[PDB]
Amino acid sequence: PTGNYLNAITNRRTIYNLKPELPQGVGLDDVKRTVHVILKNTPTAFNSQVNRAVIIVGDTHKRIWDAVASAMPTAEAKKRPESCRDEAYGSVIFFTDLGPTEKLQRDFPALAAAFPTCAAHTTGAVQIQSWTALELLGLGANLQHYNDYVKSALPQDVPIAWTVQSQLVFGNNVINVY
Amino acid sequence: PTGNYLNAITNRRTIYNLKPELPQGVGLDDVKRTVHVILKNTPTAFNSQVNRAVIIVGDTHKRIWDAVASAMPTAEAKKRPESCRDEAYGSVIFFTDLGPTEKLQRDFPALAAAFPTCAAHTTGAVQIQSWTALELLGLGANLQHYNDYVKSALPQDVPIAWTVQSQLVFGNNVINVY
């Protein structure tokens, strides 16, 4: 075990078996740092620093997935949001500040095409890491992409420029050589 | 010493001081498998599995950077690639197979505007993890987004549907608790 950083990656996958667990031996503000230290340590191309995040829990967590599971009207296509608001302790949701990405498109009008793409790179860079780290604490977590649904459902104290990217619900190659 | 996954995230930064180093105690194929299992264990959304990569070295490394540092005409814009060919051991270049995403767009024409984003997310996940893990071995690495240029410089053994995303040259959050 050295840069056994791989073993933490290999032991990680989508977990739907979820109970609103603390979990054992680890509080909430513990989790708060874990994602915080990733947003702070994740390289955004050209120091744009566009990706942010919001963690939601309790009746504020249940409040959103209950809103999605009403915009979903077919029962068998709502056993995902309602199993997210009745089985999960909370959910980490990630954003990308479209603000800077609009500024870089301004000052560098010639490269105003890689900027939206360089932001999509870094936001998925904090997603996989927070996810792979939450599962190290003991939690179980899964992906969700109800972006537009939670975006409208999102409260008012949110910057409207924060584009919704993901919802982390917690609870070979060729080588040359010719 | 527990889920000290964070320590590797913190102990990671762009390195330009590069010598074509093995490095000590670590062969090349040592590096090869590190990324090989990051591409393999990365959650491509909807199991599209579009993440591709190529490790480049030797006079095939200097060959491509010599091509980029020749389309750059102004000296001060050649200081990057010519230092990437004459100071580096090699480069990991990452792709996203446009194949599956095109298939997903076809089958689900309604969601055909989330697939390119779900591909940009997953590539911006194998990049950061490889970079974070290559520096665990002792190497020095950095981001390089000289796309199209290196893409054109690529030989013919590559699929023309592989989209060059990056070149890995090796050598606050609101709590919403009401």
From Swiss-Prot, chains A, B:
Q: Cellular component terms, GO, for this chain's entry?
A: cytoplasm; nucleus
Q: Which UniProt keywords apply?
A: Cytoplasm, Fatty acid metabolism, Lipid metabolism, Nucleus, Oxidoreductase
Cofactor remark: Binds 1 FMN per subunit.
Q: Cross-referenced Pfam families, in alphabetical order?
A: Nitroreductase
Which reactions is this enzyme annotated as catalysing?
A: 4-(hydroxyamino)quinoline N-oxide + 2 NAD(+) + H2O = 4-nitroquinoline N-oxide + 2 NADH + 2 H(+)
Main localization of the protein described in the UniProt heading? cytoplasm
Where, by residue number, does the polypeptide cross the bilayer? none
Cellular location of this protein? Cytoplasm; Nucleus
> GO terms for molecular function, please?
oxidoreductase activity, acting on NAD(P)H
Which cofactors must be present for this protein to function? FMN
Q: What is its induction?
A: Expression is inducced by cadmium and selenite. Expression is also induced in the presence of the mycotoxin patulin.
Q: Name one GO biological process term.
A: negative regulation of fatty acid metabolic process
Which CDD domains does this UniProt record tie to the protein?
Answer: Frm2-like
Please give the family membership noted in the entry.
Belongs to the nitroreductase family.
The function of this protein is: Type II nitroreductase, able to reduce 4-nitroquinoline N-oxide (4-NQO) into 4-aminoquinoline-N-oxide (4-AQO) via 4-hydroxyaminoquinoline (4-HAQO), using NADH as reductant. involved in the oxidative stress response. Plays a possible role in the metal stress response. Involved in negative regulation of fatty acid metabolism.
List the protein's name.
nitroreductase FRM2
Species this chain originates from: Saccharomyces cerevisiae (strain ATCC 204508 / S288c) (Baker's yeast)
What gene is this protein a product of?
FRM2
